[PDB]
């Protein structure tokens, strides 16, 4: 959990939401990443799971950004 909390911060600032998605999406890219990091498999599983939520949380911001922006427009039309 310590390693997970630390990892969450790292992927929030240094890694962009766009970059985070390419990693999480492609199995080939994830394998190369966990191998370079020399992660035990259990930690790799924990990391992907924790990162899935972070991505979803950032996509919720973008989906809300698209929705708020439409309502932002629709209000000015009246």
């Amino acid at each position: 959990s310590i390693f997970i909390e630390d990892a969450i911060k790292y992927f929030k600032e240094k890694v962009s939401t766009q970059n985070l998605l390419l990693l999480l999406t492609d199995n080939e890219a994830w394998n190369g990443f966990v191998a370079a990091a020399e992660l035990p498999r259990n930690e790799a599983d924990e990391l992907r799971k924790a990162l899935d939520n972070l991505a979803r949380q950032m996509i919720m911001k973008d989906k809300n950004w698209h929705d708020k922006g439409q309502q932002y427009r629709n209000w000015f039309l009246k």
């Epitope: 191998a35 498999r41 259990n42 790799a44």
Partner: antibody, heavy 121, light 108 residues
Framework: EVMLVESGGGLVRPGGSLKLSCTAS????????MSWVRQTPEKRLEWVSA????????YYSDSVKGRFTVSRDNAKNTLYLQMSSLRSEDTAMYYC??????????????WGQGTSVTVSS | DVQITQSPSYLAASPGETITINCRAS??????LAWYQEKPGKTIKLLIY???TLQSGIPSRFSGSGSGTDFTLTISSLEPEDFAMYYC?????????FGAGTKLEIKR
């Protein structure tokens, strides 16, 4: 059927050198990570080394680090283990083994019959 | 290194019976524990990987269970060919580490 055949084993003196080879058959060798495992006279299994499918990463046990070098020739379907500064404790049956491809480190789904190495004066 | 304690070292049983072999890892390794069978004149065979998944072609007599650091291999309805040497191994991280093994002998 998957087949692994080790060779290059034999007699060696303390401080001597041996290069083991493992020819792989019945599958696409270049697709799979490989490991070297040995069984001592006390029938203890001991993992020694491993190499990724493309030799990007190599791994060694502490007992062997700095003395052994794992390599591979995908074109010749062959796995190698160059052993240097051999000790009496290196006396064992040496197996090569194919790793399952779910994770870069994984279980060993196929083993060779093994090649014997005896380190003695 | 992950230290693995395999027990018992020896097992005496008869055909038709059920036995279990245990393995405890020195740290949490999730499910990534493998079971191997060794018989004379034969290559070492993978029975089960990732704790509970049978390898293709392995008989249904074998099954894998576990909890936390502990893992258990079951062999039920024992056949004569099942009497052999058994080893556990974690494949969660390098270096791969093995249990000291279990010899399953014929009771008489």
């Amino acid at each position: 059927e998957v087949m692994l055949v080790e060779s290059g084993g034999g007699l060696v003196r303390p401080g001597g050198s041996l290069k083991l080879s493992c020819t792989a058959s019945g599958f696409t060798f270049s697709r799979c990570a490989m490991s070297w495992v040995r069984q001592t006279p006390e029938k203890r299994l001991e993992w020694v080394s491993a190499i990724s499918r493309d030799s990007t990463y190599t791994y060694y046990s502490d007992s062997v680090k700095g003395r052994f070098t794992v390599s591979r020739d995908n074109a010749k379907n062959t796995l190698y283990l160059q052993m240097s500064s051999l000790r009496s404790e290196d006396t064992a049956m040496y197996y090569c083994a194919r790793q399952i491809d779910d994770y870069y480190v994984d279980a060993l789904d196929y083993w060779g019959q093994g090649t014997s190495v005896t380190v003695s004066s | 290194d992950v230290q693995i304690t395999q027990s018992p070292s020896y097992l005496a049983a008869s055909p038709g019976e059920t036995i279990t072999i245990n393995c405890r890892a020195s740290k949490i390794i999730s499910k990534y524990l493998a079971w191997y069978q060794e018989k004379p004149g034969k290559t070492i065979k993978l029975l089960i990987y990732s704790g509970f998944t049978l390898q293709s072609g392995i008989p249904s007599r074998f099954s894998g269970s576990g909890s936390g650091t502990d893992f258990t291999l079951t062999i039920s309805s024992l056949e004569p060919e099942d009497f052999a040497m058994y080893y556990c191994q974690q494949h969660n991280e390098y270096p791969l580490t093995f249990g000291a093994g279990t010899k399953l002998e014929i009771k008489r």
